[PDB]
Amino acid sequence: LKNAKEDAIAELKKAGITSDFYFNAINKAKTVEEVNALKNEILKAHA
């Protein structure tokens, strides 16, 4: 049950942040909360 993870990555692509390194990070994240935290950090980093 990690659909929020792939949605996070898709949403990240939608934002325009195109780097597989971040996708590896998000996929390495053990929990959905980690996924969201990562996505938010990445977002703030390239916002």
Cα 23 from chain centroid (whole Å): 6
Q: Are 44 and 17 in contact (CB under 8 A)?
A: no
Only one residue has tokens 């996505």, namely 39
Q: How far is CA 29 from CA 1, 5, 21, 41, 45, in A?
A: 13, 9, 13, 13, 18
No. of helices (H) and no. of strands (E), the chain: 3, 0
CA 32, CA 5: separation in Å to the nearest integer? 6
| Deposited experimental method | NMR
Which residues does a chain break follow in the chain (C to N more than 2.5 Å)?
A: none
Domains along the chain with CATH numbers: 3-46 (1.10.8.40)
In the numeric block, which tokens belong to residue 22?
Answer: 């971040």
